[PDB]
Design a binder for this molecule. Structure first.
Ligand code: POV
Ligand code: POV
Ligand code: POV
Ligand code: POV
Ligand code: POV
Ligand code: POV
Ligand code: POV
Ligand code: POV
Ligand SMILES: *[C@@H]1O[C@H](CO)[C@@H](O[C@@H]2O[C@H](CO)[C@@H](O)[C@H](O)[C@H]2NC(C)=O)[C@H](O)[C@H]1NC(C)=O
Ligand SMILES: *[C@@H]1O[C@H](CO)[C@@H](O[C@@H]2O[C@H](CO)[C@@H](O)[C@H](O)[C@H]2NC(C)=O)[C@H](O)[C@H]1NC(C)=O
Ligand code: NA
Ligand code: NA
Ligand code: NA
Ligand code: NA
Lengths: 115, 303, 101, 51, 51
């Protein structure tokens, strides 16, 4: 508060109407009345906001995009895991005699445990 | 654990089990990881993928903490796991050294309380007031709000929250944990010479001081033409700046920022102490497992 | 051996690697927690030696008369009751009035 | 060097801090009671706001 | 990905492929990096690279 002006119940050119009010307005000022009415028109929405500040304490809002590229970096692992599995199955079908039915048998071999 | 906002500490931990377990799935499904651990011969049909689920966590944790591992995969489907999980490490470990450099050199002491309402919820602060002054006559007649609930605090624990004067409580708040309810002219005077004691919150009441005058006088019509004259030229403010100034505390120095002791980090002597005891228990826990196997191998179990 | 157990005790703390690389679960937690003991200590060292050398770079010796007014540690000093205090007691610049205070 | 730069900066909280911010332009109600306090002030912090 | 500009990240990845290919050329061209990976039974003429 830069300035300390203050409002006031006005009173005409010199008159004792100021004396009955300055008494009576201090009873409203000290009991509760200028806080029960100030919070009756200056209330508003009562808006809660911002949870005030995180303020450079890094969360998900800044470095959360690496969990995009970690998600994108595992999608290109699964689609190439098919690609290595198709590359040797195309090679091994050329070798002995047989077709792509043994490529499923190559899945039947590699579905086993530690050999 | 402060510099990364523990949503990220829970996401990285759920990604250190995530990318780890997928690398188990990619390796056993890929053909090139089926190579021989015994390359002295061409093969003894001993062709075996190295990545067990214990080793699957081991490239997970071993790459996240910069020390490396022993596996270092060969198949291109297990290089793309090894090419992204490494780049997932050099941002999380290079934001940890970024924030913890930025929390030691520039610190801002956050207060737990900011008003009379946020102060009202925590009863561990032991509020207090100046007993039998002008402040207790405000809360006794207070039937308004929150401040009525603070009256139930002071009436419950008298002779401990009712310091008999201003000066005794300033000695009390300097030692104990205390939070005044007193005049905002003296609070502006104490906080300029005793800079450990700031004014949180703001105005709750506005009485306002004033020059006294006997009952019926022609002075008061000419006193107010002199006081309101001093408000507008700022003389009433420049005299207010003159007396309540005092020393002044430009306290921003950051104080050689921190010689870092046990007082800041000591949990890594606790998580170290709560880590090694966890491994002694699993040492005996698998020692009985070998005895559980030896119970089934020869004939004998417990002897 | 004990000659090699310092080697995982030293090499894991200095991030250059190791030679052992433990192979079973009862030595994966001690091999694992001790790695997390390193990455907090070494990143509370790089993240604190930065925090000394950017603190004593923000500070600078006083170069003017208003900068010394913000330094209540360094006490002013002057020749007493002479021509120097004569300029300072009637100044209304309010930067030198703070020096008079 | 990013996360210690946007931690040194802070929003303005007083009337002297806004005097050091020549980017943010002041604004007021014109020729009224607000400028009446500012044109006759000799505090020289608010005279800088008048400038 | 902010504290380095988008001119450095475009060049670091173009220096990664610039040193992955040149080290591939030199390791084949050099005489010493040819070696047999089988010293368990040496003198085998089974010369292979890791490169
Ligand atoms: C030595 C070799 C190094 C290779 C590194 C390659 C790095 C590539 C860099 C290229 C620079 C080009 C500039 C712009 C590119 C944007 C990228 C990005 O931010 O995310 C993009 C995808 O993310 C990816 O691009 C894929 C990354 C994960 C898989 C990488 C595996 C690497 C294996 C190597 C083996 C070769 C296989 C890969 C070949 C490329 C898209 O993100 P977004 O659109 O913002 O998502 C929001 C969409 N929304 C708004 C609708 C919700
Ligand atoms: C089968 C293959 C393996 C897949 C799984 C691997 C297993 C392990 C994987 C991950 C383990 C750890 C991560 C999980 C944690 C949650 C993620 C998260 O935080 O959300 C982040 C994602 O940001 C977005 O939500 C923006 C929109 C994303 C659209 C789709 C992204 C894919 C990009 C293209 C994909 C194709 C690329 C093709 C390139 C050629 C940020 O969230 P937010 O929205 O900013 O707000 C927070 C909301 N929240 C609090 C709820 C989080
Ligand atoms: C979103 C959908 C998915 C994306 C689509 C992705 C497209 C398809 C992705 C990748 C293509 C291949 C995938 C499966 C094969 C595994 C790769 C491999 O092992 O390398 C082999 C090279 O390849 C050769 O076999 C020799 C021929 C050279 C090929 C071109 C150079 C490779 C450069 C980089 C490759 C491409 C990089 C990316 C190029 C842009 C290694 O040689 P080898 O013969 O295996 O060794 C002997 C075998 N033995 C040890 C058992 C005896
Ligand atoms: C393993 C995951 C990480 C831990 C789980 C949590 C993650 C969940 C996320 C969020 C929930 C967190 C809330 C938990 C609160 C319970 C109390 C507590 O534990 O802390 C107590 C001890 O701390 C420990 O003992 C735990 C750490 C050591 C054991 C776990 C690692 C050992 C190896 C792992 C083996 C598995 C390998 C896994 C591989 C990936 C705190 O100590 P205190 O006595 O209160 O000191 C207070 C002093 N003060 C008053 C001055 C302030
Ligand atoms: C506060 C106090 C708490 C603690 C005390 C509590 C008191 C209670 C007292 C005692 C209870 C404690 C018992 C000890 C537990 C482990 C015993 C052990 O080592 O045997 C086995 C488990 O070890 C592993 O390696 C884990 C992974 C298993 C490998 C594949 C088997 C099936 C996988 C499916 C399930 C896996 C997990 C699924 C997800 C969870 C050994 O396994 P391995 O095959 O011989 O390892 C090969 C290693 N190699 C790769 C180098 C060749
Ligand atoms: C970064 C990594 C973390 C841990 C690092 C290592 C542990 C920590 C090591 C020592 C702890 C120090 C004791 C605390 C006292 C502090 C005082 C001080 O500053 O220096 C003191 C000690 O000076 C040294 O520390 C010399 C460095 C030791 C080298 C040996 C470590 C290699 C271990 C590997 C060997 C392989 C074994 C075999 C492996 C198979 C003396 O200086 P001062 O006289 O007090 O100066 C005062 C100046 N002042 C007043 C201005 C302040
Ligand atoms: C940069 C590193 C990269 C990521 C690292 C890995 C990611 C996961 C790491 C951490 C995940 C933590 C999740 C929540 C964050 C903690 C919040 C909390 O309340 O903690 C509390 C309980 O919690 C504990 O005591 C546990 C401490 C966590 C460290 C786990 C070490 C295990 C190593 C993992 C690998 C083992 C290797 C095994 C190998 C097989 C303790 O704090 P407080 O009592 O609340 O103190 C109050 C003061 N305060 C109010 C200001 C806070
Ligand atoms: C067999 C293979 C052999 C080669 C290896 C290939 C792999 C690695 C090679 C390079 C790594 C990545 C390639 C591009 C990045 C290089 C630098 C750049 O940014 O562009 C530069 C443009 O300069 C050019 O336009 C020349 C482009 C020709 C490519 C090779 C030149 C370097 C070799 C000869 C070097 C002779 C130097 C003297 C040596 C004592 C930009 O300029 P700047 O330099 O970044 O900044 C200085 C200018 N400034 C101050 C005003 C801002
Ligand atoms: C820093 O502030 C803390 C505030 O908690 C001070 O701690 C109090 O110290 C007094 C000693 O006179 C104790 O009686 C209190 O119990 C402490 N408060 C607690 C533990 O909450 C601490 O003294 C201050 N340090 C310095 C150097 O001023
Ligand atoms: C709390 O009060 C002050 C604030 O730091 C500490 O002591 C003061 O130190 C300044 C110099 O920094 C002096 O100018 C004051 O005169 C000192 N005041 C007092 C009352 O000693 C004090 O150590 C802090 N801590 C405690 C526990 O009181
Ligand atoms: Na730093
Ligand atoms: Na390293
Ligand atoms: Na290594
Ligand atoms: Na570092």
């Amino acid at each position: 508060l830069i300035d300390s002006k203050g409002y006031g119940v006005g009173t005409p050119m010199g008159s004792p109407y100021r004396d009955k009010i300055t008494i009576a307005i201090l009873q409203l000022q000290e009991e509760g009345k200028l806080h029960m009415m100030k919070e009756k028109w200056w209330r508003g929405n009562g808006c809660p906001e911002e949870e005030s500040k995180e303020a450079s304490a890094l969360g998900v809002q800044n470095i959360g995009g690496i969990f995009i590229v970690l998600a994108a970096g595992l999608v290109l692992s699964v689609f190439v895991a098919v690609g290595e599995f198709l590359y040797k199955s195309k090679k091994n079908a050329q070798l002995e005699k047989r077709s792509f039915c043994s490529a499923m048998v190559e899945e039947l071999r590699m579905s086993l445990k530690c050999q | 654990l402060n510099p990364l906002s523990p949503d990220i500490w829970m996401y990285v931990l759920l990604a250190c089990l995530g990318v780890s377990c997928v690398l188990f799935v990619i390796a056993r499904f890929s053909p090139y990881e089926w190579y021989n651990p015994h390359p002295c011969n061409p093969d003894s049909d001993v062709v075996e993928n190295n990545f067990t689920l214990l080793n699957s966590f081991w490239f997970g944790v071993g790459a996240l903490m910069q020390q490396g591992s022993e596996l270092m995969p060969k198949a291109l489907s297990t290089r793309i796991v090894g090419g992204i999980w490494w780049f997932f490490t050099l941002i999380i470990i290079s934001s940890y050294t970024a924030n913890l450099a930025a929390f030691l050199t520039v610190e801002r002491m956050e207060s737990p309380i900011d008003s009379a309402d946020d102060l009202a919820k925590q009863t561990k602060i032991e509020y207090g007031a100046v007993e039998d002054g002008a402040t207790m006559t405000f809360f006794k007649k207070s039937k308004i709000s929150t401040y009525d609930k603070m009256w139930a605090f002071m009436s419950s624990r008298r002779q401990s929250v009712l310091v008999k004067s201003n000066e005794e409580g300033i000695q009390r708040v300097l030692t104990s944990d205390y939070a005044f309810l007193m005049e905002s002219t003296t609070i502006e005077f104490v906080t300029q010479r005793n800079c450990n004691l700031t004014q949180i919150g703001g105005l709750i009441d506005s009485k306002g001081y004033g020059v006294g005058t006997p009952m019926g006088s022609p002075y008061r019509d000419k006193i107010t033409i002199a006081i309101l004259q001093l408000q507008e030229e700022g003389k009433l403010h420049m005299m207010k700046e003159k007396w309540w100034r005092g020393n002044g505390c430009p306290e921003e120095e950051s104080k050689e920022a921190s010689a870092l002791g046990v007082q800041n980090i000591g949990g890594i002597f606790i998580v170290l102490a709560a880590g090694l005891v966890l491994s002694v228990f699993v040492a005996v826990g698998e020692f009985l497992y070998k005895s559980k196997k030896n119970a089934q191998l020869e004939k004998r179990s417990f002897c």
